[PDB]
Amino acid sequence: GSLTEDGLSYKEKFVVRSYEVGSNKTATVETIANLLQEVGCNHAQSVGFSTDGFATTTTMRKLHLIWVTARMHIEIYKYPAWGDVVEIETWCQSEGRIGTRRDWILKDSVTGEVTGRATSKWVMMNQDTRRLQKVSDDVRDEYLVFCPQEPRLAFPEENNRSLKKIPKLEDPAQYSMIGLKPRRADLDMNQHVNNVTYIGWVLESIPQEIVDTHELQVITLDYRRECQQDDVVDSLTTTTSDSQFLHLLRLSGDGQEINRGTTLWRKK
Amino acid sequence: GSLTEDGLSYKEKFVVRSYEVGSNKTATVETIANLLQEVGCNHAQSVGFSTDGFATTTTMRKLHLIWVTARMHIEIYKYPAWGDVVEIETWCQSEGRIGTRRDWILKDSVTGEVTGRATSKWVMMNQDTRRLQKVSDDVRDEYLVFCPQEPRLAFPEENNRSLKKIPKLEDPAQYSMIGLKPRRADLDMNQHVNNVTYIGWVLESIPQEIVDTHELQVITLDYRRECQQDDVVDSLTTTTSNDSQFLHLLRLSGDGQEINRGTTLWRKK
Numbered sequence: 001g002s003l004t005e006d007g008l009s010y011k012e013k014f015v016v017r018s019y020e021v022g023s024n025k026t027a028t029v030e031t032i033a034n035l036l037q038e039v040g041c042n043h044a045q046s047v048g049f050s051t052d053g054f055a056t057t058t059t060m061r062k063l064h065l066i067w068v069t070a071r072m073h074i075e076i077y078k079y080p081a082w083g084d085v086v087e088i089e090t091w092c093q094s095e096g097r098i099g100t101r102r103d104w105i106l107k108d109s110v111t112g113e114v115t116g117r118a119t120s121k122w123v124m125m126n127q128d129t130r131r132l133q134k135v136s137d138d139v140r141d142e143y144l145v146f147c148p149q150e151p152r153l154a155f156p157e158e159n160n161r162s163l164k165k166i167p168k169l170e171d172p173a174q175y176s177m178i179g180l181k182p183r184r185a186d187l188d189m190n191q192h193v194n195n196v197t198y199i200g201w202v203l204e205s206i207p208q209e210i211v212d213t214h215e216l217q218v219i220t221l222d223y224r225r226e227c228q229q230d231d232v233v234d235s236l237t238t239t240t241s242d243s244q245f246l247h248l249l250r251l252s253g254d255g256q257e258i259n260r261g262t263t264l265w266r267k268k
Numbered sequence: 269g270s271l272t273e274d275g276l277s278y279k280e281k282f283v284v285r286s287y288e289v290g291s292n293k294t295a296t297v298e299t300i301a302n303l304l305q306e307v308g309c310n311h312a313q314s315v316g317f318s319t320d321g322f323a324t325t326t327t328m329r330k331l332h333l334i335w336v337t338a339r340m341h342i343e344i345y346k347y348p349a350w351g352d353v354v355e356i357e358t359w360c361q362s363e364g365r366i367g368t369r370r371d372w373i374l375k376d377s378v379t380g381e382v383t384g385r386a387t388s389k390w391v392m393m394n395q396d397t398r399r400l401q402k403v404s405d406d407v408r409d410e411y412l413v414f415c416p417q418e419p420r421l422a423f424p425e426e427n428n429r430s431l432k433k434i435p436k437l438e439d440p441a442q443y444s445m446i447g448l449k450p451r452r453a454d455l456d457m458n459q460h461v462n463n464v465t466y467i468g469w470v471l472e473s474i475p476q477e478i479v480d481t482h483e484l485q486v487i488t489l490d491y492r493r494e495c496q497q498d499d500v501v502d503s504l505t506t507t508t509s510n511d512s513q514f515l516h517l518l519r520l521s522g523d524g525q526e527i528n529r530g531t532t533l534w535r536k537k
């Protein structure tokens with residue numbers, strides 16, 4: 001992996017692994033999501049950020065501030081096959097005082113064609129109180145030297161899927177997977193549940209026949225609250241329609257919302 | 269990755285990834301186990317085997333036969349850090365009519381030192397009936413051309429941990445993790461539960477304080493029966509012992525049907 005000539009984006013190639021593929025012998029959406037995390041971390045390392053947190057500036061570390069994912073949006077046209085090489089380019093951009101945005105472009109290494117794209121919204125939070133906050137001049141001036149100054153959007157089109165408001169699923173759900181718990185493999189280096197686990201939990205309530213006859217094209221996921229190591233989750237899905245689904249992840253007990261999302265699937 | 273000069277073993281280098289590391293910023297035992305299965309599959313591909321089943325010979329495919337893991341034994345001296353390069357060499361050997369054995373050696377790419385080793389026992393089974401069987405001459409002659417003829421063992425020692433009989437844990441267990449279920453990420457390309465998931469399930473019943481103050485040095489795991497996609501598992505652990513040893517049992521949450529038994533050895537950080 002390496003920063004591009006202008007030092008304003010990062011590229012990395014990955015060979016798809018045997019355990020990373022599903023029933024169609026292509027990478028799962030959770031494998032893709034893991035690769036977006038990996039290329040994101042390597043981009044931050046290559047521009048001076050030191051491994052404690054993700055892209056934590058000097059001012060942020062002193063004020064106990066972290067970047068937290070609020071929304072992840074992934075669109076896949078072709079899932080790479082087992083043994084294929086996929087090249088991912090990533091970059092970040094300031095969104096004024098709201099927060100930051102990280103975008104990715106996935107390409108087939110042999111053909112050079114775009115096989116997928118992703119966009120994500122990140123907000124500033126205090127590590128200890130978990131209270132959100134706007135981005136100050138001091139932190140903006142520290143990370144702006146690593147971003148392209150003109151807009152560079154993975155999803156440029158007006159009125160696109162990445163910017164649509166997601167409603168709250170109403171009971172009763174059409175489908176559900178109850179009693180989902182994280183294991184140690186689901187935790188990151190800071191003992192928090194890996195954000196990719198929530199994508200898997202959302203997909204658990206999709207019926208197996210849809211998974212067997214369709215391919216996931218679009219996933220939009222909002223992160224409202226974290227699931228602790230000793231929390232239990234219920235995954236709910238209702239068809240809203242290609243097949244479209246509305247999703248809700250909530251705590252098995254009190255029904256406290258942790259995530260809401262939408263998926264779009266194409267007939268194979 | 270590539271076969272060595274003699275074509276009798278395979279090597280591959282891996283850069284440790286951010287999501288593959290635990291609290292100590294080093295690769296977890298499940299990341300290591302995933303890398304053993306990746307280097308194993310690339311070795312089989314490099315010597316002519318198809319992507320259908322793992323190392324299924326021409327005669328095996330015709331008779332609906334597959335290689336299935338009966339035991340996995342892993343010993344780690346140093347877990348590679350996030351961003352470090354680890355080199356893994358793997359090879360196969362015939363164990364007469366019993367089955368085959370696959371061994372691995374893990375090395376630090378920068379120093380060349382052995383940081384871990386693994387050995388595994390594989391048996392022949394019919395895909396459909398699940399009935400075990402001995403290795404015929406026809407099958408042996410097909411895979412023997414890919415194996416070193418003289419013995420090559422990752423665990424040579426006279427009385428070593430990889431060949432010890434594992435007892436069945438007696439109720440009540442000291443520790444337990446109940447109601448463990450596989451999700452889609454836990455399934456392989458043939459929709460069976462990935463063998464690495466069972467290692468994670470075994471480790472789930474180890475208390476967090478042991479995990480926090482100790483490092484896993486040795487894991488020996490026996491595979492008795494497969495966990496289906498709609499099965500629910502209970503993980504049981506009892507301390508048997510500076511080092512801490514544990515006896516493990518994985519069984520179906522309902523009828524208590526045994527799926528795995530194992531042992532772990534941990535050392536104080």
Ligand SMILES: Cc1onc(-c2ccccc2)c1C(=O)O
Nearest residue numbers: 033036037040041069072195196
């Ligand atoms: C870095 C990084 O880059 N992408 C993600 C991410 C966020 C949400 C869902 C999936 C991946 C991520 C993380 O810290 O989890």
Ligand SMILES: Cc1onc(-c2ccccc2)c1C(=O)O
Nearest residue numbers: 301304305308309337340463464
């Ligand atoms: C190939 C391959 O090489 N190693 C394994 C394996 C088996 C048991 C536990 C961990 C990995 C394995 C598999 O098919 O699961």
